[model samples]
Target: LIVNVINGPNLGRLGRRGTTHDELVALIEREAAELGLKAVVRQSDSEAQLLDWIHQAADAAEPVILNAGGLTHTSVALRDACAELSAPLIEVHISNVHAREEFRRHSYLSPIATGVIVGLGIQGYLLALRYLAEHVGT
Candidate 1:
């Protein structure tokens, strides 16, 4: 099985906590293998690039795990693109958006997502993959 992990905005930078993006991707890839799946984790600061990945997943009907970062609070385009997904979409946030600033409490992606994961740190990605490994493609 294949799972697409897309991270946007500042996620490509050092882990807001302590987990670096490279390590996070490595861990997700390893965990994915253990679960009999391949995880292609990607990070980008460009909206167009992120939209391209989303479009690919939509056309393939492949499951996607996305952390849209700042775009989570804004971006109608991102929300619209996500609505095209025939497969599952799990929105992730390293920190608890609800607990953060008032602006972070709102998400343009959550409504269209199959699931959402927040405040779980880097493990959230692996956890999302684990969920997909069992529940999807069955």
Candidate 2:
């Protein structure tokens, strides 16, 4: 199976923020490979770029792991685009949004996501990968 992992805004600063986005991507790729799935991971600081990636995933009916950064609490357009995805959309947050500011607690994507993983650090991505590997096309 093919899974697309999309990260948005400030996520490229993962390591600086914690484990670095590249490290997270490497970890996810390795785990996904172990599970017999192909992972296409991408990160962008631009909303439009992120949306375009989501759009491609939607068109392919591929499962998505999206960390939309600040846009998670904002961006109806991003949420709208995500809603177009036919496969499971797993929302991921490196930091536990619920434990942060009131604004971070709300997500425009969570309601539409098949599941969500938060506050578990980079492990969250691996967990989401496992979910798709076990659940997709079943």
Candidate 3:
């Protein structure tokens, strides 16, 4: 199975910055390789780019694990994109958004996503990938 890991906004600096998300992405990639799955990870600062990728994922019916970073709680366009997809989509967060800042508690993607994984640090992406790869037919 092909799993696309879409990291949005500030997520591009995961390992480089002090966000501690760098290790998580590494873990996800390692686990994905062990499962014999193709993991395509991409980061975008632009909402349009992110939406374009979501559209592409939908068109290809590719399973996706999306970490929308700052856009998770906002961005109706991203949420609507998730709703439009036929592929199984999972919304992931390195930090537990609900347990953190007040503004981070809301998510536009959860309603359309197959599942939501939060507060698992970066490891959440790996779990989401494994879940989708094993369960989602596409």
Candidate 4:
């Protein structure tokens, strides 16, 4: 199965998250291979880019693993885009958003997501892919 792994906003930048974006993507791609799933990982600083990708995934009827960064707490347009997805949507946060700021606890995408993963570093991405791989028959 094909899974769109979309990362948004500041995620495209580097280093501050303890794990670099390049390192994170490499981990995801490697784990996806092990799980026998194709993970198309993308990252963008622009909200428009993220929305466009979400639209494509919706049209392709593929699952999505979205880490919308700060937009997860805002961005109604993104939430609307994700709501149109036909396959499972797994929301992932590398850090524990709930333990950060109170504002981070609110996710505009979570209500529509099939499940969520957080605080487990890049392992969260791997875990999300595993869930998609296992859910193929469901």
Candidate 5:
């Protein structure tokens, strides 16, 4: 199975958040490999770049795990791009957006996601990967 792990905005700053983005990718890659899946992880501060990656995942019909940072609450365009995904699109957040700001409580992506995982730190990505592994052939 092949899965796309996409991150947006400041997610490249994952070490400050916990593990660095490269480290997070390594961890996800290891976990996915153990589960017999190939993980393609990408992160960008640009909305256009993120959208392009999501579009590719959608076109390929590959499962996606996205952490859209501030865009989660703000970008309808990002949400629209994600809505085009034919495969499972799991939304993830390292921090509890619900606990941070009233503005963060709403997500344009959540309504369209296969599932949403938040507040669990970097493990949220691992859990989303596990979900994809479990459901890959179903």
Candidate 6:
């Protein structure tokens, strides 16, 4: 299965950024190789760019995982894009949205997400990747 990892907004910073996203991305790549799946990771700070990537993945990959950062709690347009894509999507977050803040508790993508990977920090991405790989294109 092909997996597309879509990171949004501040996520480009990753490991150098607030969270250990580089490590997370590395882990996802490693685990994806072990699972016999190809992992494609992309980072975009622009909402339109992310949506474009997701739409592309709909035709290119079996599944897509998104860590939409602050956009997770808002951006109905992003959520709608997720819904419109034919590919299955898993929403991820490094920080525990429910435990962080009131605003973080809400997720615009959750309703459309096949599942959510959160609170596990960088590991969440890998878990979501593996799950999607195992399930999608089957």
lDDT for 77 (candidate 2): 97
Model 5 regions lying over 4 Å from their true place: none
Query: Could you tell me every candidate's TM-score relative to the true structure?
Result: 0.96, 0.96, 0.88, 0.95, 0.96, 0.88
lDDT of each: 0.92, 0.90, 0.83, 0.91, 0.91, 0.81
Report the poorest 10 consecutive residues by lDDT, candidate 4.
12-21
Residue pairs with clashing backbones, model 2:
14-20, 15-20
Candidate 1 vs 3: which has more TM-score: 1
Error of 2 at 55 (Å): 0.9
Tell me the TM-score of model 1.
Answer: 0.96
Residue 64 shift from truth in candidate 6, angstroms: 0.6
TM-score of model number 3? 0.88
Off by over 4 Å in 2: none
Q: After superposition, how far is residue 110 of candidate 4 from its true place, in Å?
A: 0.6
RMSD of each: 1.3, 1.0, 2.3, 1.2, 1.0, 2.0
lDDT by residue (63-94, candidate 5, tens digit) is 99999999998999999999999999999988
lDDT by residue for model 6 over 1-138, one digit each (tens)? 778888999887866754465666777889999988888888888999988987787666458888988888779888877887677788988877788668788888898888898888787877886776667453
Candidate 6 residue pairs in backbone clash: none
Q: Which stretches of candidate 1 lie over 4 Å from their true place?
A: none
Which should have the higher lDDT, number 2 or number 3? Answer: 2
Name the lDDT value of residue 89 in candidate 6. 85
